[PDB]
Amino acid sequence: GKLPPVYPVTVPILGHIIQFGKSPLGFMQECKRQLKSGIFTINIVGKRVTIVGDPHEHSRFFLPRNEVLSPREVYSFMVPVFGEGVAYAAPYPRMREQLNFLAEELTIAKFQNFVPAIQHEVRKFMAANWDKDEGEINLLEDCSTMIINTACQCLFGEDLRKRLDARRFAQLLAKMESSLIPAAVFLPILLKLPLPQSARCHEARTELQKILSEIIIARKEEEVNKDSSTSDLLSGLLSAVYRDGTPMSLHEVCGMIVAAMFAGQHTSSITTTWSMLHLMHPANVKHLEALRKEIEEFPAQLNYNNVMDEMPFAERCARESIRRDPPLLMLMRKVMADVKVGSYVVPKGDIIACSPLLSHHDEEAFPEPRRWDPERDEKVEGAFIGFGAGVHKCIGQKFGLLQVKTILATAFRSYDFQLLRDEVPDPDYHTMVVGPTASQCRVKYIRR
Numbered sequence: 488g489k490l491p492p493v494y495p496v497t498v499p500i501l502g503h504i505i506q507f508g509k510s511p512l513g514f515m516q517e518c519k520r521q522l523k524s525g526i527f528t529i530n531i532v533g534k535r536v537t538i539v540g541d542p543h544e545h546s547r548f549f550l551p552r553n554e555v556l557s558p559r560e561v562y563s564f565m566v567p568v569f570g571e572g573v574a575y576a577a578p579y580p581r582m583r584e585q586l587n588f589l590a591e592e593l594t595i596a597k598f599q600n601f602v603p604a605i606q607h608e609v610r611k612f613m614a615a616n617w618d619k620d621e622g623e624i625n626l627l628e629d630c631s632t633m634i635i636n637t638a639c640q641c642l643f644g645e646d647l648r649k650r651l652d653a654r655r656f657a658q659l660l661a662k663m664e665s666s667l668i669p670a671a672v673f674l675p676i677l678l679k680l681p682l683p684q685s686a687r688c689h690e691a692r693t694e695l696q697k698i699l700s701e702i703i704i705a706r707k708e709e710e711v712n713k714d715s716s717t718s719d720l721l722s723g724l725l726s727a728v729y730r731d732g733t734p735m736s737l738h739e740v741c742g743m744i745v746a747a748m749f750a751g752q753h754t755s756s757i758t759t760t761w762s763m764l765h766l767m768h769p770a771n772v773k774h775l776e777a778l779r780k781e782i783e784e785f786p787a788q789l790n791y792n793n794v795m796d797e798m799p800f801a802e803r804c805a806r807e808s809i810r811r812d813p814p815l816l817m818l819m820r821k822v823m824a825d826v827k828v829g830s831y832v833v834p835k836g837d838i839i840a841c842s843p844l845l846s847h848h849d850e851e852a853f854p855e856p857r858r859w860d861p862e863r864d865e866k867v868e869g870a871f872i873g874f875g876a877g878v879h880k881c882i883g884q885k886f887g888l889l890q891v892k893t894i895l896a897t898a899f900r901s902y903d904f905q906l907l908r909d910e911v912p913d914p915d916y917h918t919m920v921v922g923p924t925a926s927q928c929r930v931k932y933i934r935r
């Protein structure tokens with residue numbers, strides 16, 4: 488049987504993990520050149536990772552069923568955050584029901600109210616922080632702030648937001664986040680070892696679950712004492728019932744809320760940040776004009792029609808930011824049985840990977856891939872994979888872009904911006920979710 492070509496190993500027991508970490512785009516491009524193949528295999532702490540770096544074969548990573556290409560082992564390092572037996576740790580049918588419940592909290596009907604809640608939080612942030620004629624800010628830090636405030640305003644009732652304000656929720660989530668070791672996918676002994684990480688994570692998740700149980704009790708009180716429907720993500724998920732006939736446990740509800748914050752917080756804020764950095768750069772003046780024309784006749788209070796139906800150009804600007812610098816660099820599954828991919832067989836036991844970073848710089852699909860051009864279209868069907876595809880395609884895609892677009896429309900309607908650098912920031916590949924380098928993100932705002 489014919490295996491993909493394997494990139495030569497120099498470093499004994501580490502393999503390619505350090506080369507890859509230093510420059511993931513650079514390293515993977517060098518692999519495909521030397522090995523004369525978009526499908527090739529690297530070595531991560533002794534483990535074979537086969538990369539499907541030919542966009543013509545993306546469907547062989549995204550479409551196979553979970554029993555063939557499994558997400559469980561790849562997400563096992565996130566078990567302390569999601570919770571044991573929740574999401575990818577659950578049997579696949581139950582995993583899919585839980586994911587569907589979350590998806591169903593992000594319906595089009597919900598979006599009707601989301602728009603003015605998002606815009607409210609954005610304007611409140613700009614009034615507190617961008618309050619003069621002009622001033623200097625760190626755009627990545629402020630976009631991250633706006634995104635946690637906007638998402639919480641959409642997803643959580645006022646009562647939950649008071650108890651668990653954006654500041655307290657950020658601290659708890661940061662505590663969970665600082666516990667993750669993605670390298671545990673390749674060194675799975677780490678999943679069993681005693682780690683101080685594990686205990687900090689369990690503490691923060693337990694505190695969150697405690698606050699949720701307390702809010703649920705407080706809600707029951709308000710419903711008794713006066714009227715008091717509060718309808719939000721928490722109440723929606725608690726109303727969910729499996730085909731089993733059984734309802735979701737608080738444990739599972741807490742895990743799904745956590746899953747939604749980890750999936751959508753850094754991705755959304757980074758997409759916003761890059762979009763803004765590109766649009767304020769002088770080279771992109773025509774794109775900034777196109778966005779300004781797009782929003783020119785919108786009312787001061789945006790509605791769902793403006794954002795969802797009337798901003799196709801702003802959506803190209805966000806997608807092309809993710810195209811050029813995808814926040815998730817590598818997507819992975821465990822190969823549970825041999826799979827043929829192009830001319831190769833990828834053996835059972837391999838990690839198979841598909842990299843948005845590598846595929847989005849394929850020069851046949853994306854000519855001049857470092858150039859940010861929201862007018863571009865992929866030249867190979869399906870080569871854009873910044874929201875994944877197929878069986879685990881992103882469920883938050885529309886909600887994320889709803890906030891990115893509302894922030895763009897609100898910010899550029901009232902402000903101009905200037906980069907304090909000649910070029911847009913370099914991507915910083917040293918974080919789990921990749922964004923522009925934070926120290927390079929100082930910008931000047933100018934009230935219009």
Ligand code: HEM
Binds near residue numbers: 754758872880882
């Ligand atoms: C706007 C920026 C976003 C980006 C670039 C992004 C990207 C991605 C990608 C690449 C995947 C596929 C992962 C894989 O194949 O292993 C994914 C899945 C997922 N995303 Fe998003 N995401 C974004 C926003 C959101 C938001 C805002 C939420 C929730 C509110 C969300 C929820 C999810 C969930 C639950 C999954 C797992 C789907 C499954 O396993 O079936 N995402 N996302």
